[PDB]
């Protein structure tokens, strides 16, 4: 029988067969009191104790969220939908352990993304059993509250203070410190990693003094807190909370009356109204997400970064080649998952209106001029590839590069990667290239499963990425082997070296997309 004693009671796990070896999996351990009823919208409350043996043998409930239903039956969109029942009782976590039980294992903690509105730890592309089997690390993932139930902000008031989802993540990190030794783990070797809004979350733990002792190192994939979609100003967050009151018949004169009204609504009543708290909106809109609450974030993150008031440790950062394409089919005209989506100069300018609603007519004309210095004039797909580049450069790549420079300027090793391989199994058309979030299967080693119809070059690439990530976690250096392997050099603000990751050749390069990023950091802010 597989039983571990925790500070909150005993828990029973389950064995899994992986690559001829055993992995011990504890799915669905509770780490906080269910935020139900009076607890809705408050910081998570520490768990007391159950008085029995909790059976952690099935993934628990994903948190309450809307569901992407644009393409019914399409794996490319539905693989991101939660594969468990939705519920407000969702603060659970999952632990994978190599067998035999390690003595002092390094812990990797996965934080899913989903624009702070969606996501669950129970998806198949987040299965952590291969990482525990192949690199003998312990893998942990937790559910956190998303959307208004996670980030409704009345700043100052303990009844809806903001960043409740980040406090959910933080409380799960506290659980790892207090309990992971009972599983074989070293709480002095904990590595946060996540993608998209999960990366943004990871980058925010580097700023929050409460998280500074709960982890060692960080990996940020396709995201950072300086991305334009990641942090709401103090009063925009408030102006959105008051609008959700009015939309649900909950406006009052007392703040706590607004909240106690909002505790009596159905979850579905709140979910259906989330999309209307904002006037404009883009495919990249984050209605309720992290904000400057004064507790977790004591100041605007860019200031804290510039002043060097953050955890000094090693980071690993990167982006995918075609980050923006995924958002084009969800709102730009002339784009469909079912053609090659070749578009005109008029449709390009309609797209720019969709993604830059408040930008002046001159700003849209400046973005157009900077992104149309064609190599070949036709090339009919020029405008299709320029719009994906605008969206990805503005929202993901130039944020990641700007965060890496400024972070490395304070004396810690940063390593930057550029993921350029499209997966043979990618359910989306070839014109969308290396999409947002499709490096993930490689990081979790899904191509290592020989029975899964991945190519031999995709197993080698993913065996290489898994090794480097596990090495970075263990030793702060993303090496593969000492011999016969490309060295990954540190990112430095002058040379700005990065490593490309693909199946042909991993190469060292310099100043990723510098001519495009120069536009977004030094000319667009003045429009
Ligand atoms: C975990 O599983 C065990 C069995 O797999 C559960 O044990 C049963 O508990 C019920 C509850 O009263 C008893 O009626 C059964 O006789 C028990 N059977 C055995 C074989 O022990 C246990 O309750 C489960 N844990 C939880 C929290 O539900
Ligand atoms: C697991 O490794 C850690 C270090 O990563 C050991 O913990 C402490 O490490 C510090 C240095 O950071 C030393 O000053 C302490 O002396 C260590 N603690 C002890 C009790 O010696 C930890 O001991 C290891 N745990 C094992 C091997 O079970
Ligand atoms: C690509 O596929 C779409 C899907 O039908 C085609 O349809 C247009 O899609 C845009 C997207 O917002 C709409 O604004 C248009 O109204 C749609 N057209 C019609 C006639 O309904 C699109 O035309 C296709 N383009 C190519 C070149 O195949
Ligand atoms: C990757 O590089 C690190 C150096 O940063 C190597 O770390 C050493 O690992 C051994 C165990 O293999 C430890 O006993 C040493 O204390 C480590 N040294 C340092 C300075 O961290 C690591 O082994 C390398 N990995 C590979 C596969 O070559
Ligand atoms: C050193 O390791 C490299 C991996 O980076 C090996 O390179 C590949 O080797 C296979 C043969 O097993 C070829 O099919 C690939 O085309 C090679 N990739 C390249 C050249 O980028 C290499 O074989 C190893 N060499 C030694 C001497 O150990
Ligand atoms: C669920 C839901 C709502 N539905 C329509 C809005 C888009 C949503 C899916 N979707 C974007 C599509 O690509 C994954 C997101 O939830 C989303 C939204 C904003 C994001 C912002 C930054 C990074 C990832 C994001 C993902 C599906
Ligand atoms: C706050 O937001 C206002 C717009 O909100 C409007 O009303 C709510 C109930 C929603 O239905 C929303 O779609 C509407 O557009 C602005 O009018 C107001 O200026 C904003 N104020 C500040 C300070 O941001
Ligand atoms: C689980 O695995 C361990 C070692 O891998 C084994 O000794 C134990 O019997 C297994 N328990 C099962 C299969 O219930
Ligand atoms: C005897 C034990 O009771 C409980 C079960 O869930 C275990 O699998 C085991 O059989």
PDB file of C-alpha atoms and ligand atoms in Angstrom, residues 460 480 484-486 503-505, ligand 5:
ATOM      1  CA  UNK A 460      15.507  13.274 -29.528  1.00  0.00           C
ATOM      2  CA  UNK A 480      22.878  18.505 -21.567  1.00  0.00           C
ATOM      3  CA  UNK A 484      29.346  16.432 -27.657  1.00  0.00           C
ATOM      4  CA  UNK A 485      26.627  19.016 -26.995  1.00  0.00           C
ATOM      5  CA  UNK A 486      26.012  22.666 -27.850  1.00  0.00           C
ATOM      6  CA  UNK A 503      15.430  19.138 -34.900  1.00  0.00           C
ATOM      7  CA  UNK A 504      17.952  20.326 -37.519  1.00  0.00           C
ATOM      8  CA  UNK A 505      20.617  22.093 -35.452  1.00  0.00           C
TER       9      UNK A 505
HETATM   10  C1  LIG B   5      27.274  13.645 -30.920  1.00  0.00           C
HETATM   11  O1  LIG B   5      25.940  13.934 -30.594  1.00  0.00           O
HETATM   12  C2  LIG B   5      25.236  14.453 -31.722  1.00  0.00           C
HETATM   13  C3  LIG B   5      23.910  14.972 -31.214  1.00  0.00           C
HETATM   14  O2  LIG B   5      23.904  16.392 -31.132  1.00  0.00           O
HETATM   15  C4  LIG B   5      25.107  13.365 -32.786  1.00  0.00           C
HETATM   16  O3  LIG B   5      24.597  14.011 -33.949  1.00  0.00           O
HETATM   17  C5  LIG B   5      23.614  13.250 -34.679  1.00  0.00           C
HETATM   18  O4  LIG B   5      24.008  11.881 -34.926  1.00  0.00           O
HETATM   19  C6  LIG B   5      23.057  11.114 -35.685  1.00  0.00           C
HETATM   20  C7  LIG B   5      23.620   9.716 -35.797  1.00  0.00           C
HETATM   21  O5  LIG B   5      23.253   8.914 -34.683  1.00  0.00           O
HETATM   22  C8  LIG B   5      22.817  11.771 -37.043  1.00  0.00           C
HETATM   23  O6  LIG B   5      21.823  11.046 -37.758  1.00  0.00           O
HETATM   24  C9  LIG B   5      22.376  13.217 -36.856  1.00  0.00           C
HETATM   25  O7  LIG B   5      22.230  13.851 -38.122  1.00  0.00           O
HETATM   26  C10 LIG B   5      23.397  13.971 -36.010  1.00  0.00           C
HETATM   27  N1  LIG B   5      22.982  15.351 -35.808  1.00  0.00           N
HETATM   28  C11 LIG B   5      23.706  16.405 -36.210  1.00  0.00           C
HETATM   29  C12 LIG B   5      25.004  16.091 -36.896  1.00  0.00           C
HETATM   30  O8  LIG B   5      23.332  17.560 -36.026  1.00  0.00           O
HETATM   31  C13 LIG B   5      26.462  12.747 -33.127  1.00  0.00           C
HETATM   32  O9  LIG B   5      26.275  11.535 -33.851  1.00  0.00           O
HETATM   33  C14 LIG B   5      27.319  12.458 -31.883  1.00  0.00           C
HETATM   34  N2  LIG B   5      28.689  12.174 -32.283  1.00  0.00           N
HETATM   35  C15 LIG B   5      29.562  11.503 -31.528  1.00  0.00           C
HETATM   36  C16 LIG B   5      30.924  11.310 -32.122  1.00  0.00           C
HETATM   37  O10 LIG B   5      29.268  11.071 -30.417  1.00  0.00           O
END
